[PDB]
Design a binder for this molecule. Structure first.
Ligand SMILES: *[C@@](C)(CO)[C@](*)(O)[C@H](CC(C)C)NC(=O)[C@H](Cc1ccccc1)NC(=O)[C@H](CC(C)C)NC(=O)[C@H](CCc1ccccc1)NC(=O)CN1CCOCC1
Ligand SMILES: [Mg+2]
Lengths: 222, 231, 195, 244, 233, 212, 240, 235
């Protein structure tokens, strides 16, 4: 019997800073035990300083991104070129996803950008449209490997102040863009080591008030 | 007389009066000008107000990053037709990853307007459109009439007293066609062209409306203090 | 939903309906009234699939109330029961049938007679002196066969009903949290508060 | 297009009248007179056939009086073909009610639905109205014996005695004169015939030019019987009242 | 819901400095039966694109008709149909990719794996894959079916990343393709010796090679192999 | 999930956890499970996240349209019934919902309605919904009285979620408190179970099963 | 389907089909609505050219939409049934979804909305009917009286009349009705309603119908003798 | 007869032009826009003294940040308001934000020309749509049955519109306070109204960023009427 879904692997990662936000994702595309492409990007600039990635089943992922990109275009036409805020984009994406509640997009969507106060924002979605703003989110095949590491290093979970008898927690603070990229690179090299569907390359998209910059790094190709 | 009750009726001399009456709605509309060189295409439009307390009716509409039009006549009909163009441009991009040709854009508008002139119940569109764009075969300018007739031109004008600007462009043809790689000079020529259609009124800062598209220039519209340069 | 009983006596119809609403391993509520008044002298109790029961009961209630306003007249219990049966008979061959069983107790004012109708989710109607739906019948019917008489009073009917509830509380596996009892007679519908 | 040939059947006049309903009523006023009289112990339906021919088959004929169910009948005035369309609808409606509630349909409910159908043709659809006026004679256990009338407007009213069709003005005056509330069926039979005899456009009223029917409780104990009179039974009742 | 009946096996392809190469054998299998031998599974579109199709042949023939019809439709009211407004490989791919995904979304897929190889108007090499699921991806080397498992490893030794493309000539690239086709004949039980090959170059244009055969095969070592362990004769 | 809401002398307490799970994977510890529908109406979420997040939001749009059309705030009964009638149309399609529409109006007073995806709609004083509902019931029932103070009621709601958060593997993260009065709903903070458990253990002397 | 636009504008800006529907209302029998301090009363004319009528079964002029709301009308009798039916259905639908009976304003707004829809829908003519809708909101003791008309406009009235010779009875009510002090009792309200109809009717025998509506679904129709007592009392006070 | 969507020889749609005549017969409605807010006011015009004037609802809320006043065949406005409210709430659902006043007006105006042989005739009512958003600030729009809408600093519609508009031409300036605008609507309404202006036969409303759209009480308007009369007598 025909199975309309497939798994293209890969993994993605979104972190938010004070005045910036990054959305990273490996460039490997796979089916079963074969590599389809070593460089197939799945993190996209969608305009209005919104970056997006829909990881899982690539056909559904591409369709969704394509539709959201189009949703941004028609938002400009219908509302006098108004800039689509990240919170508004998130709600719009929920309706795109939930519109196919009974034949879902098999993807884990993450978007990143700046909120209306200029502060870094990351939203993550399930396949049927539930969403939540977070400082930190990993999605895709290696999400279970990367996420607990982020809890520890970004949000300082389980880390207490030395000598305080485990009474005072390590205080939360924003990370610099330099420190965030370090965590992203270490997260993906660790994920590459222990997950077969992760490797080849790492593409990071950084979002500041000035625009959308890109950075690329090699990953192990085995 | 007896043959103008609807669009489905021919007159004894072979005329469609409802289509001609729709054409008349364009003549009453405010003037708008279109012209192009080899590198850029420009729309200039005189906007109209109800009174001093009102705003000025927007004449220019964007269809894609590389295409858009100006209007003269029934504005709601221009909204319908522009929306159709937006969808057709968009269909071409999603399905074929292809920017819609300005010539095909005209063909699609022609065929949409025509269907309204051959069926009972409906009515012709009551608006004329000047479509500009830049595609794989360079700059383009199209004139749309609600009879269905679409015409590609170097320059033209439609609306009230459009004959003055049309005569000017007919004289200036050899000059403005060679304004390549110079946006401001091509606009200046368009602003001087529309000025030949003015009576008692002159071009002010919230009156003039300019749009441009070209080789390394997306379709963008200029209003307000952004057109003060050209007065 | 589980236990609904009905007893027709000389001058009235008595409906008893369990108060428990259970979901999974939790009794969510112990004061649920599994009945709707269709008209001043007609009462319908119900039991079955969650959601379907109330949705169906209220749908019938609305239709009978609409009729009452239109004609300025109360439909007979027989007429109401036939309407209800037809709706269930339509339902059973639908894409998604109403899985609801009902008892209709009413007092016909023209005949001056109490009437009890039992209708299952298939649209199977029967007029009875006493009726029940679900597993309740497997205990109560045999008990009522023995103790029931056709000329009983309302008070005798309530004692006969107590005897049924006691038996169910003794031998039924589930705790149904007692019953709400309602009486239908010439003067209309009223609820017994202490049972 | 087709706008040119549209009569616009469902519009108002400047005076606030429905052209087509008024003209349909004008049509009905030329149709054979039909009378309904309601007594305490029954109902009479009398109707005059339209100018009869001697070679018309009289015994196996039905023009004016139709049976809707065992408890309800109607007298027709207007286009017979139109009336039959409505009668079959009314017959079906009665059976739907019986199927649903296991009870014979109350007279008014049947009358209202039939009148609501007529109303529809005056407000939407762009079709001509039904050129028919009914006299409904029936019984139910709520109101007992009932007479109603409905017309192309879809408006219906209840009556003790009423006429439709031709010469209703003269016929209504005569009924208003001799009618009283404690009247019996046999008296109402005589009134119905006497009224037609005086309002007829014919020279003399005969058995072959009439249709007659009664709805009595004259069956055995608490049940209603519908009698559609045979030709010979009309001949006898006409002699018995001294008209021929 | 379908099941494929008459099927075509691997389609292989790669990029080189000036263009792209694509190849696929001429077989139409009917399960284990090697039913049809004269089946062309490379279909050119204009003078700048070649679409290589594997999977169900009835669906392949349907796609042929769609592409044929696309060329006709593009020529309508188009004075520049053989110039600036000619069909690009990217246009042809996106159209097919749209169709493939729409059909999978209606639970009635075109049971195929497709590779669109060509050269754009600006000289850029185009090579992209799409299948019954609507999944799309691009890579210096692309292959379907068994080709994905056996050809890609060999072709990736020549062009392992982007920077290796300018360093790869058409001679070296074609040699690697022809070798891959031989390996597939050794190891794929639904392959044939006969195949077609197509080159799309930005300078020399479209070159379509028919009736090629796998040759220079190694079989002589078979004579020395006896039994399955202990046998000596 | 674990969610509860109970009615008492001083109005309505509403308490929820903040965990989200995909099987045994803890997806989030910071999910909002209370919907602020309007200043007088709250909605709790237990079941499918998307279904709740989508439809209870939609419910709020329908409640806004009601007060525009009728020039009056919607009743808790009418609000709950819009949702219950909606999910009943989708019955069998596979929606997963157990919600509580909580609010105050003049005509009704403080009111709680249980609504779930198979069409059940129940008015009641106490409800607990979710995978850890039984754990919450245990503590809530055994300590519940109508005459609880606002201070004690808030704590019991908080303590009941904590009880479930501890025992139920699919409940945890943090507690979100709400108090609904005649004047409207009042938010009473986010309470991380990480710190709250030990604070409650020490001060209350409970949770002796755990290694202190 | 029949599509023709029957209701359309004319050069002077009028919709004649709506205006001609008002003429049908002007032809209809007079109907009056008067609201007191704790009640509303609906009075209705019945023309006396129809003797030999059966008043038991003849459709009554005042109709119950729900147990707490009533509707009277003037104009085409057949048209009124369609509005009444739709109103009764909507009343039950409101109870089903909102779990509360309709307000009088809501019910009026619905009926008025139906009437309006028939003024700009293809293939239909407007309703030749104006209505008086009266009653009491659930758990409320403030009397409500609304009017609707074919165009679709609706509004609340302290007292109002519609139908034939309605301008005469409106003239009467305008000087006889005090806003500062409405009819304090049921008797006072009914008397003023009967008085107003006696300016137009003819005889006070079987020509006047009166229906009294009080709070909490308390609606009753008066009989001939009960109404006749008001007629007898008013005439004796008049001779002065 | 003749088609519904027919053009006149002059190039106008007959039915649209005829609907404009219906609007001229309608009661007066005035709107004035300022940097402190937008004010909307209407003539109620009760046909008879027995009619309870508070039930006359010619000013209407679309959303918290958008209000609306009407003139002409006011029954036709009900479906326009219904659409506007749905459009406003629907956009909030899809985008988690308030909808622009211009976008709302455009949505309403899309209904206008959806008639022919869709509804049977154009709307016989004009609308003044007033509101506020973060991008373009305080706005006032005039929405016609032609499908056209103009933005206005001030605008009058209805029977006394041409006389009131000429008065608004002289009186309006870019520095008007909200209180000044309130009095100005009352002043101009009193000039064009048939019967004498008071709190019962005229109604005021406004929309501000802070408090949103509010219809004024009869007590509040009565004081503004008294304040207006005193100021005119003071010079
Ligand atoms: C307690 C915490 C759990 O019992 C509560 O009941 C909460 C309620 C809160 C969130 C409002 N419920 C859940 O957390 C809920 C449990 C659940 C899941 C699925 C169906 C019913 C109940 N969890 C979810 O809804 C999660 C939300 C997080 C962000 C992942 N989402 C999913 O499980 C999604 C969508 C589920 C779905 C429903 C209907 C059709 C299709 C899918 N599924 C996945 O994310 C799949 N999974 C992710 C990891 O990659 C492998 C696939
Ligand atoms: Mg490997």
């Amino acid at each position: 019997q025909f199975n309309p879904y497939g798994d293209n692997g890969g993994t993605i990662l979104g972190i938010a800073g004070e005045d910036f936000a990054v959305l990273a994702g490996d460039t490997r595309n796979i089916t079963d035990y074969s590599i389809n492409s070593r460089y197939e990007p799945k993190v996209f600039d969608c305009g209005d300083n919104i970056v997006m990635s829909a990881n899982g089943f690539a056909a559904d992922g591409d369709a969704l991104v394509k539709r959201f990109k189009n949703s941004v275009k028609w938002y400009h036409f219908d509302h006098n070129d108004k800039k689509l805020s990240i919170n508004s984009a998130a709600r719009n994406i929920q309706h795109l996803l939930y519109g196919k509640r009974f034949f879902p997009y098999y993807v884990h969507t993450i978007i990143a950008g700046l909120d209306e106060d200029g502060k870094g924002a990351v939203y993550s979605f399930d396949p049927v449209g539930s969403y939540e703003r977070e400082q930190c989110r990993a999605g895709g095949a290696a999400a279970s490997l990367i996420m607990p590491f982020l809890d520890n290093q970004v949000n300082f979970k389980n880390q207490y102040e030395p000598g305080t008898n485990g009474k005072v927690k390590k205080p939360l603070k924003y990370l610099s863009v330099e420190e965030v990229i370090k965590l992203v690179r270490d997260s993906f090299t660790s994920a590459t080591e222990r997950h077969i569907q992760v490797g080849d390359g790492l593409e990071i998209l950084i979002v500041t008030k000035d625009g959308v910059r890109k950075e690329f790094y090699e990953l192990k190709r085995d | 007389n007896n043959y103008d009750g609807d669009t489905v009726t021919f007159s004894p001399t072979g005329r469609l009066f409802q289509v001609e009456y729709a054409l008349e709605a364009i003549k009453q509309g405010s003037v708008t000008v279109g012209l192009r060189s080899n590198t850029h295409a420009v729309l200039v439009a005189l906007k109209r107000n109800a009174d001093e307390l009102s705003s000025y009716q927007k004449k220019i509409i964007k269809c894609d990053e590389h295409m858009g039009l100006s209007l003269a006549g029934l504005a709601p009909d221009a909204r319908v037709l522009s929306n159709y163009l937006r969808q057709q441009c968009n269909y071409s991009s999603l399905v074929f990853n292809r920017k819609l040709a300005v010539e095909r854009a005209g063909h699609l508008l022609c065929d949409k307007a025509q269907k309204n002139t051959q069926s009972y119940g409906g009515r012709p569109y009551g608006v004329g459109l000047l479509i500009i764009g830049y595609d794989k075969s360079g700059a383009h300018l199209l004139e749309f009439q609600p009879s269905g007739n679409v015409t590609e031109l170097y320059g033209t004008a439609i609306g009230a007293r459009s004959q003055g600007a049309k005569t000017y462009l007919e004289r200036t043809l050899d000059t403005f066609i060679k304004i390549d790689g110079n946006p401001d000079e091509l606009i200046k020529a368009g602003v001087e062209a529309i000025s030949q259609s003015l009576r008692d009124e002159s071009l002010t800062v919230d009156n003039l409306s300019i749009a441009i598209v070209g080789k390394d220039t997306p379709f963008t519209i200029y209003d307000g203090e952004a057109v003060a340069k050209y007065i | 939903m589980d236990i609904i009983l009905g007893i027709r006596v000389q001058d009235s119809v008595i409906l008893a309906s369990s108060k428990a609403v259970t979901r999974g391993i939790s009794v969510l509520k112990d004061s649920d009234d599994k009945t709707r008044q269709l008209s001043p002298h007609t009462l319908m109790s119900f039991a079955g699939e969650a959601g379907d029961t109330v949705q169906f009961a209220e749908y019938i209630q609305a239709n009978i109330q609409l009729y009452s306003i239109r004609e300025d007249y109360e439909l007979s219990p027989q007429a109401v029961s036939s309407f209800v049966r037809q709706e269930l008979a339509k339902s059973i061959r639908s894409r998604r049938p109403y899985q609801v069983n009902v008892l209709i107790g009413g007092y016909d004012k023209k005949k001056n007679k109490p009437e009890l109708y039992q209708i299952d989710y298939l649209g199977t109607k029967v007029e009875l002196p006493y009726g029940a739906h679900g597993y309740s019948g497997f205990y109560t019917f045999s008990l009522l066969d023995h103790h029931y008489r056709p000329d009983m009073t309302t008070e005798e009917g309530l004692d006969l009903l107590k005897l049924c509830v006691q038996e169910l509380e003794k031998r039924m596996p589930m705790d149904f949290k007692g019953v709400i009892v309602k009486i239908v007679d010439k003067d209309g519908i009223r609820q017994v508060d202490d049972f | 297009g087709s706008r040119r040939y549209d009569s616009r059947t469902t519009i108002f006049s400047p005076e606030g009248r429905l052209y087509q309903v008024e003209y349909a009523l004008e049509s009905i006023s030329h149709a054979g007179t039909a009378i309904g009289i309601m007594a305490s112990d029954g109902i009479v339906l009398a109707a005059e056939r339209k100018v009869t021919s001697t070679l018309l088959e009289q015994d196996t004929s039905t023009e004016k009086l139709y049976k809707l169910n065992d408890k309800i009948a109607v007298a027709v005035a207007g286009l017979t073909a139109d009336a039959e369309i409505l009668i079959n609808t009314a017959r079906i409606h009665a059976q739907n009610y019986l199927k649903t509630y296991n009870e014979d349909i109350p007279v008014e409910i049947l009358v209202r639905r039939l009148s609501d159908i007529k109303q529809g043709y005056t407000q939407h659809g762009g079709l001509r109205p039904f050129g028919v006026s009914f006299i409904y004679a029936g019984y139910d256990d709520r109101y007992g014996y009932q007479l109603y009338t409905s017309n192309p407007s879809g408006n219906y009213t209840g009556w003790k005695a009423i006429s439709v069709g031709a010469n209703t003005s003269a016929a209504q005056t005569l009924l208003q004169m001799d009618y009283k509330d404690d009247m019996k069926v046999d008296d109402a039979i005589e009134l119905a015939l006497k009224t037609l005899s005086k309002t007829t456009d014919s020279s003399a009223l005969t058995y072959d030019r009439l249709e007659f029917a009664t709805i009595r409780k004259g069956a055995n104990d608490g049940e209603v019987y519908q009698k559609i009179f045979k030709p010979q039974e009309i001949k006898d009742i006409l002699v018995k009242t001294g008209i021929t | 819901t379908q099941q494929p009946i008459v099927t075509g096996t691997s389609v292989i392809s790669m990029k080189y400095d000036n263009g792209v190469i694509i190849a696929a054998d001429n077989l139409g299998s009917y399960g284990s039966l090697l039913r049809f031998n004269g089946v062309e599974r490379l279909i050119p579109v204009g003078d700048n694109t070649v679409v290589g199709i594997s999977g169900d042949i009835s669906d392949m023939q349907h796609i042929e008709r769609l592409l044929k019809d696309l060329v006709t439709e593009n020529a309508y009211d188009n004075p520049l149909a053989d110039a600036e407004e000619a069909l690009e490989p990217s246009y042809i791919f996106e159209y097919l990719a749209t169709v493939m995904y729409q059909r999978r979304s209606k639970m009635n897929p075109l049971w195929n794996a497709i590779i669109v190889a060509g050269v754009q108007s600006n000289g850029d090499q185009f090579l992209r894959y799409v299948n019954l699921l609507g999944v799309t991806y691009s890579s210096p080397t692309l292959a379907t079916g068994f080709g994905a498992h056996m050809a890609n490893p060999l072709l990736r030794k020549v062009v392992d990343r982007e920077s290796d493309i300018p360093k790869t000539t058409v001679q070296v690239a074609e040699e690697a393709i022809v070798n891959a086709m031989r390996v597939l004949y050794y190891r794929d039980a639904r392959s044939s010796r006969n195949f077609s090959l197509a080159i799309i170059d930005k300078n020399t244009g479209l070159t379509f090679k028919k009736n090629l055969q796998v040759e220079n095969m190694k079989w002589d070592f078979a004579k020395d192999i006896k039994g399955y362990g202990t046998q000596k004769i | 999930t674990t969610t509860l809401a109970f009615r008492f002398q001083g109005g309505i307490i509403v308490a929820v956890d903040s965990r989200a799970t995909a099987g045994n994977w803890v997806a989030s510890q910071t999910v909002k499970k209370v919907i602020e529908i309007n200043p007088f109406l709250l909605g709790t979420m237990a079941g499918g996240a998307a279904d709740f997040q989508f439809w209870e939001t939609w419910l709020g749009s329908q409640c806004r349209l009601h007060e525009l059309r009728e020039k009056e705030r919607i009743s808790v009964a009418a609000a709950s019934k819009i949702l219950s009638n909606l999910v009943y149309q989708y019955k069998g399609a596979g929606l997963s919902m157990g919600t509580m529409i909580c609010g105050y109006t003049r005509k009704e007073g403080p009111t709680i309605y249980y609504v779930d995806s198979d069409g059940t709609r129940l008015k009641g004083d106490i409800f607990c919904v979710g995978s850890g509902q039984t754990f919450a019931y245990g503590v809530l029932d055994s300590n519940y009285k109508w005459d609880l103070s606002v201070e004690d009621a808030l704590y019991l709601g908080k303590r009941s979620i904590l009880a479930a958060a501890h025992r139920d593997a699919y409940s945890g993260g943090s507690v979100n408190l709400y108090h609904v009065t005649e004047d409207g709903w009042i938010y009473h903070g986010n309470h991380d179970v990480g710190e709250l458990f030990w604070k409650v253990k020490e001060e209350e002397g409970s949770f002796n099963n755990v290694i202190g | 389907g029949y599509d023709r636009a029957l209701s359309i504008f004319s050069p002077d800006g009028h919709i004649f089909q709506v205006e001609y529907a008002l003429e049908a209302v002007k032809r209809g029998t007079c109907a009056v609505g008067v609201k007191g301090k704790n009640c509303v009363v609906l009075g209705c004319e019945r023309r006396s050219t129809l003797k030999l009528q059966d008043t038991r079964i003849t459709p009554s002029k005042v109709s119950k939409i729900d147990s707490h709301v009533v509707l009277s009308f003037s104009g085409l009798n057949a048209d009124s049934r369609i509005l009444i039916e739709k109103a009764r259905v909507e009343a039950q639908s409101h109870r089903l979804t909102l779990e509360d009976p309709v307000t009088v304003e809501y019910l009026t707004r619905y009926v008025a909305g139906v009437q309006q829809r028939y003024t700009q829908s293809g293939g239909v003519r407007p309703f030749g009917v104006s209505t008086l809708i009266a009653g009491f909101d659930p758990r409320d003791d403030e009397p409500k009286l609304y009017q609707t008309e074919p165009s679709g406009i609706y509004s609340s009235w302290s007292a109002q009349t519609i139908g034939r010779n309605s301008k005469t009875v409106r003239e009467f009510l305008e000087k006889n009705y005090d806003r500062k002090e409405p009819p304090a009792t049921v008797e006072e309200c009914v008397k003023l309603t009967v008085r107003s109809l006696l300016e137009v009717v003819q005889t006070g025998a079987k020509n006047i119908e009166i229906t009294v509506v009080k709070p909490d679904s308390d609606i009753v129709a008066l009989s001939s003798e009960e109404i006749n007592q008001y007629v007898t009392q008013i005439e004796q006070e008049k001779q002065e | 007869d003749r088609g519904v969507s027919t053009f006149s020889p002059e190039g106008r749609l007959f039915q649209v032009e005829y609907s404009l005549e219906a609007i001229k017969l309608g009661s007066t409605a005035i709107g004035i826009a300022t940097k402190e807010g937008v004010v909307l006011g209407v003539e109620k015009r009760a046909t008879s003294p027995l009619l309870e004037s508070d039930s006359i609802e010619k000013i209407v809320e679309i959303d918290r940040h958008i209000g609306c006043a009407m003139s002409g065949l006011t029954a036709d406005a009900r479906s326009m308001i219904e659409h506007a409210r749905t459009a406003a709430v629907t956009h909030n659902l899809y985008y988690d934000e308030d909808i622009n006043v211009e976008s709302l007006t455009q949505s309403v105006c899309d209904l206008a020309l959806r008639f022919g042989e869709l509804m049977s005739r154009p709307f016989g009512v004009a609308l003044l749509i007033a509101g506020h958003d973060a991008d373009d600030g305080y706005q006032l729009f005039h929405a016609e049955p032609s499908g056209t809408f103009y933005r206005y600093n001030a605008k009058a519609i209805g029977s006394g519109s041409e006389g009131a508009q000429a008065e608004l031409l002289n009186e309006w300036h870019s520095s008007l306070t909200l209180k000044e605008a309130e009095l100005l609507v009352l002043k101009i309404l009193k000039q064009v109204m048939e019967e004498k202006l008071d709190e019962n036969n005229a109604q005021l409303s406004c929309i501000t960023k802070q408090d949103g759209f509010k219809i004024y009480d009869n007590e509040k308007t009565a004081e503004l009427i008294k304040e207006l009369k005193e100021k005119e007598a003071a010079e």
